[PDB]
Amino acid sequence: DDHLSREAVVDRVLDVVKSFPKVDPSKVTPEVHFQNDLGLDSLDTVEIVMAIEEEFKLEIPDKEADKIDSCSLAIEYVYNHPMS
Amino acid sequence: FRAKVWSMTGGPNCRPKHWRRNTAIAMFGVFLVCIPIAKLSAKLEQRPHMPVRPIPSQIWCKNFGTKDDYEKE
């Protein structure tokens, strides 16, 4: 029931894409999208979502689950969600 | 809004300051009214059988070994 703030979430969220081998862990940004800037395949978009779900216990509804095409949307979302 | 509703069985987290004092009264209340239940039962518990060994209930009871025959009920 600690409700961790942005300070402890900026690292955990970014580690998910840092561990991704297709994207080079040299220019990973808290505010970046993998479509163009990081150069990721259009299929692995939801794989990052599953990986971050395996870290924080929360499942976004599928209607806007893939609406998060940027790293910023995911981290603001997981902070917005209370039970994460 | 929980403070507005009475919640006769106690609120969700109802924690009175002197809850120990009330619990002492409540436990004392059970004991004092339990005695009439025990005292009124002493005129009951008819068991015609006689146990092979003495039990500790002979002091407050006498309804054992007396109701032998069944021709004058």
Binding site: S42, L43, T45, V46, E47, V49, M50, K57, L58, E59, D62, A65, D66, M83 | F1, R2, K4, V5
Partner: protein, 109 residues
Amino acid sequence: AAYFARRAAQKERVRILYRRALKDTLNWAVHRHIFYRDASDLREKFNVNQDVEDVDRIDKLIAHGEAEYNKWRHPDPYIVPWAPGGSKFCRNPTPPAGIEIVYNYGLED
């Protein structure tokens, strides 16, 4: 055509069905040391075509994919307990925002 509305639907369905397939793969693979290989197989299967351009060769493919996916469902899928369908959904929900209780009702004069 030059209308991306149809293809955006395709790029939406592919991600949705991939997510659902990964979820079901996790459900079927109770142990995870098989889940890695199974997930790799699913990812590779989605890359089998990976080059569709014609609109006549997508509807049949999506229909076949949906039919094959629906054939195995793991009747007990994973739902988070506080999720809408879990084991503690509406466990102790937060009380409604605005509601008031009047005290002196039924008085006279």
